[PDB]
Design a binder for this molecule. Sequence first.
Ligand SMILES: O=C(COP(=O)(O)O)[C@@H](O)[C@H](O)[C@H](O)COP(=O)(O)O
Ligand SMILES: O=C(COP(=O)(O)O)[C@@H](O)[C@H](O)[C@H](O)COP(=O)(O)O
Ligand SMILES: O=C(COP(=O)(O)O)[C@@H](O)[C@H](O)[C@H](O)COP(=O)(O)O
Ligand SMILES: O=C(COP(=O)(O)O)[C@@H](O)[C@H](O)[C@H](O)COP(=O)(O)O
Ligand code: NA
Ligand code: NA
Ligand code: NA
Ligand code: NA
Ligand SMILES: [Zn+2]
Ligand SMILES: [Zn+2]
Ligand SMILES: [Zn+2]
Ligand SMILES: [Zn+2]
Ligand SMILES: [Zn+2]
Ligand SMILES: [Zn+2]
Ligand SMILES: [Zn+2]
Ligand SMILES: [Zn+2]
Lengths: 332, 332, 332, 332
Amino acid sequence: PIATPEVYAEMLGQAKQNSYAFPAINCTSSETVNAAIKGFADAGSDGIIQFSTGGAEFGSGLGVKDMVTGAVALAEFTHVIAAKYPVNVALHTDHCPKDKLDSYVRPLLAISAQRVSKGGNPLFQSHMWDGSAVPIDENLAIAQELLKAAAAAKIILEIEIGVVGGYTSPEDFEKTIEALGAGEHGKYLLAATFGNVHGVYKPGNVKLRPDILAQGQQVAAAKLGLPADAKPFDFVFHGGSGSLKSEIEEALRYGVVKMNVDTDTQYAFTRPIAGHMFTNYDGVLKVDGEVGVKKVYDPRSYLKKAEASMSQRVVQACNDLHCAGKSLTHHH
Amino acid sequence: PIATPEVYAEMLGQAKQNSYAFPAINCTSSETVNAAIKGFADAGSDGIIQFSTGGAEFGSGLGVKDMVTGAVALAEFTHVIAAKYPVNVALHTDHCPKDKLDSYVRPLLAISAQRVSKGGNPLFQSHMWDGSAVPIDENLAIAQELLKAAAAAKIILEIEIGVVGGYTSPEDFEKTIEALGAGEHGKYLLAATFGNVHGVYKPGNVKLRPDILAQGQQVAAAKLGLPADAKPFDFVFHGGSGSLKSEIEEALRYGVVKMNVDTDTQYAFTRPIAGHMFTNYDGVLKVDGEVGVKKVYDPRSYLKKAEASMSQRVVQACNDLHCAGKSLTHHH
Amino acid sequence: PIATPEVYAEMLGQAKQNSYAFPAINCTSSETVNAAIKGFADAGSDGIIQFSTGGAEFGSGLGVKDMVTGAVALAEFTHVIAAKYPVNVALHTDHCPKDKLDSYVRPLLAISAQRVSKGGNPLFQSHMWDGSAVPIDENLAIAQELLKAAAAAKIILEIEIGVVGGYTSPEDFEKTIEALGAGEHGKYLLAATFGNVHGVYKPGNVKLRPDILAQGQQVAAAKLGLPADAKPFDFVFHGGSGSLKSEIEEALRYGVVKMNVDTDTQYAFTRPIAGHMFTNYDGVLKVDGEVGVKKVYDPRSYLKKAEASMSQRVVQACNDLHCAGKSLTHHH
Amino acid sequence: PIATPEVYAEMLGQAKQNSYAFPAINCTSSETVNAAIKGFADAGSDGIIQFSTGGAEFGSGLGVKDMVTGAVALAEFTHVIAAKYPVNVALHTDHCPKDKLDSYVRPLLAISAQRVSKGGNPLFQSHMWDGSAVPIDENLAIAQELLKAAAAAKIILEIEIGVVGGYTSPEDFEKTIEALGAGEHGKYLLAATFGNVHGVYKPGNVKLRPDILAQGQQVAAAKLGLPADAKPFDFVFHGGSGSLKSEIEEALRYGVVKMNVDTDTQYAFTRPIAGHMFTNYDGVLKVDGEVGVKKVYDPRSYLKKAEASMSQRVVQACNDLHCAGKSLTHHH
Ligand SMILES: O=C(COP(=O)(O)O)[C@@H](O)[C@H](O)[C@H](O)COP(=O)(O)O
Ligand SMILES: O=C(COP(=O)(O)O)[C@@H](O)[C@H](O)[C@H](O)COP(=O)(O)O
Ligand SMILES: O=C(COP(=O)(O)O)[C@@H](O)[C@H](O)[C@H](O)COP(=O)(O)O
Ligand SMILES: O=C(COP(=O)(O)O)[C@@H](O)[C@H](O)[C@H](O)COP(=O)(O)O
Ligand code: NA
Ligand code: NA
Ligand code: NA
Ligand code: NA
Ligand SMILES: [Zn+2]
Ligand SMILES: [Zn+2]
Ligand SMILES: [Zn+2]
Ligand SMILES: [Zn+2]
Ligand SMILES: [Zn+2]
Ligand SMILES: [Zn+2]
Ligand SMILES: [Zn+2]
Ligand SMILES: [Zn+2]
């Protein structure tokens, strides 16, 4: 099913308590949503499907190019699909900067607030406010008001401090606890930067500093008067693709509950499509006066392979993050 | 917008009256739906999006493989998208044989009946019952009961007499009018076979006999006591891909209001994907120890091109069928 | 065997007498030479292998880029190969303009003159002087001196009047007979231009005017005091690829004895190489950390297919030109 | 130039004395010969071009399939080309088993014996007798008679003890010295097996035991009454492709003077051809009614790239084997 707000909160609480995390898979289409959910289900795992501003625009089609439309359309699709799987699937929106709040996160929050006012649940279960490009005080001012609105709509807010490549300071960690508390005013997720980078580069290139996350937890624990081993933050690991297994493991120890994956699932989706086009070149092209071969230019022929391959990469993510076999539905 | 039942009936009435037809484009995904609707809009045309049993299964994902789920999920997606376009978009389900009625058309009819009972409109605006594999009397017995159910849910029924390749007889035309009337008991569309073939073959191979359709109209007109030039049937032209322009023109003269297209839009969708994989071979594959190029293995990079190409083929269909520039929204 | 000068003269005499012609296939390598000769043999035909200035440069390798070296190296290769086939194979050099005479045709003539001085036969059996870019009188002045040198080395000279696309005038035909005679001072071949074009374009684009050739023969016949149906010129048809069968047939009627083919045999050679790379993409590339598949990146694996395909196109040329089954070895 | 027998003997003597070796590059065509020689020249190195039985058959064309013809034709080509480069190029034939001696090595020896009888030099400068599939005594009996014939024709014989994958024993090393001496009855090259394997596999898979070669030299030195550090054998390293740099270095220390390379130069040749076909897919194929693009289906367009790439891999071999910059022409 789609994760209810209560189930999603329980998911994130259980992950933190047990030092595991969920994959948050960027999706752009019916096929990619289907691939992600099947991956979660094959791993016996709960999971998160997320739409970026560009993913939402793409989902709305070239004739519309509207983020809200694409996110709503893909979310409605996902609601129907997820009902047919035993695992819990949460819907999330990715990076939304200041100049897109009025045309992405705010209108989506309003849609969910209307649903909740009628006794229903929100359309999305979390939204990201990415204020990393503005000063920390402005970032957290906007975050505080969005957190109030989100919590009232039964939605978790993700925020970002520091810019992910394409480090978070002790004072920025302190300011975050001061402005937002530690969940008692509404749950929030913190994308803290620790040398992580969006994209996939050669092994060695990306140098992660998970000690930054350890330090952040210690800073928060001290502020809140908690024991030194407390983990008050629910961290989000952006730029998960291409990471070493050992790096993921270390991040889990310090309270990462959500690792975002896009690039690696993109490669997994595209890889069999490329293979299909090459091995069926004279079927997908009308060559030498011939009319091609419908069986292989039917988009389903290669998109099924794309789907299955992306699902396998999602299963790998669930095993890397130690959420495999832990779905809160306990269907086993 | 999505075509209301009233608008869809008006669409088909206007098409018949003016000797034009609408494309019915088989779709399987968010991208193909988006491509089809953008094509209709670019042509200033109303249009039909249809899901086959296999298309619906595909739309539900490999982890579900359920026709109803896929059709509902894709229909819900389409409802959100179509609201953002000025043209009218009708939703249809394609070939449903006897052994799939209980797991496709009937449950979908029930969903729409529930919507209509609450003062809303149906999810789909037409459904196909394909009884061509059973004797004509059984075909029309099932058709009569489905027509009653469909009309009560504000839905048009498509039926089929004769098997499309992969001819309809005067007596079968007569039996159809006798069993179903001529629209006064609910509108229905008739897929009569006249040498048409699903798929795309070399020019010349497919030999159409549109005189069969002319004869059918004359048979119906005589039965109903109408003038010899009356067109009591709303015909559906299956196997539209690969047809000569002149063949399409002749079919229009005899009351074809709906021409189904799948194979040609499949080729149009896939063609730029093939091209993308070849020209970006060392970006979509990790070759010689390199890590590929995200910008070109991002599925959106080639799927945008696929979408645009399929939309162009849909525009061509609207111009071939003479529905271009005739959308009943008259947005111009 | 390699055509002796006597056999080559007999070949061209028999072709003219019987209104057929030989293909002159541009070659660039051991594989293309092998493909051409096998094509002649499969057709039971004599034939001509020719090297352009660029083909010769290519044959010499990137480390040499010397026309004489490449032509000699490929000719020596061809002498060994042709001895193993029952058909007669003549060696020819293609377009040599004024500024390349000193570095292509003249040094090659000198090599053959040395061979002949020792009681042997020439290395090449014909050479082309292409003076079409200089005024006709200068063209024919150079031609006359080259004809003397060529005939003394038992070599046939090809000349060109008019520029082939990328028409020959009555006066230019007259001047040619006046300057060179009609074979009694040494045989020569005349590349007269008649709307022919190097390269392959869409059907219709190239508009041939074989009546120009008919007129040329009539002009020569009148000059020589021969009957009006005499064919004093041995014509060469440049730009043979892409021609209609009927166009080739008409050219034969007017004394074409040699039709040059390059572009169509290039396509035939490359076509299966392209196919091989696509269907074996993950064998010819080291992908995803794998080491490829030697069996398919071994150049012989695709070059055998290239060879066989080019040979088939050469067989087609022999049947188009009506030289198939007519080899002067009469091996049958 | 082509290596004279005297120069080739000096090459191998200098290599042994200075602990370096020459690449022996398998070639199959004019393009591959040109690529190999250009690689030697670019590295300022002497080198060896070799033809296998299959390479020779391929070189003769599908219409001939004769090893002697192909080897002679390619050798004659190579003689013309090599004269234009400052470095010394030796010609060699690769693996010839017992049942092919009468149709490969023996007839080639006879051709060279005839040349030498007339005061000239042999066509090839070395030939391989591969008797590894027969018992050692029979192998060396045939080797002794072939060595006499080869030496009389100014040709070096290569022999093989042990079968290369797809170890040489102290007694087999001893028997070799006993039967053939240490060069005083004619120079010979010894392909001793030491865990080497033809082909290219993943790193680690091939486990070389160069200590076998060290042991062989010690066994020979003891037999001949030489100091323990003497290197009486000139070793040949079959299966050179895919080897670690450090493995090559160790083999050099023990008297390898010739390392055979085929698979890696095959990959280098094919790799840009594959790339060319993919990036020019709509030029090398006639697609959607178009006629392709001659500029990219001209075989020279991709074969130049193939040549250059193979030459680069040959330069790498010369640097790996430490023969780069050491050509005995000292042209610098
Ligand atoms: O952290 C993430 C994944 O990083 P990688 O897994 O790609 O390293 C996501 O949050 C990215 O920001 C997202 O893929 C960007 O999507 P786009 O704006 O292109 O639609
Ligand atoms: O008439 C039609 C189009 O014919 P063509 O345009 O393809 O000739 C449709 O009704 C086809 O039956 C449909 O494409 C079959 O879809 P599938 O069962 O493969 O999902
Ligand atoms: O007439 C000919 C063939 O014409 P097509 O058969 O190609 O139309 C030949 O003489 C051409 O001039 C020759 O292919 C040019 O070769 P290049 O200078 O590129 O090495
Ligand atoms: O040692 C060699 C190279 O090994 P690799 O460099 O390929 O490992 C050669 O002697 C091989 O036996 C030769 O490539 C076989 O050629 P083929 O019989 O296929 O025409
Ligand atoms: Na990353
Ligand atoms: Na069709
Ligand atoms: Na041409
Ligand atoms: Na090897
Ligand atoms: Zn991110
Ligand atoms: Zn459990
Ligand atoms: Zn159909
Ligand atoms: Zn209007
Ligand atoms: Zn030409
Ligand atoms: Zn005969
Ligand atoms: Zn070997
Ligand atoms: Zn020196």
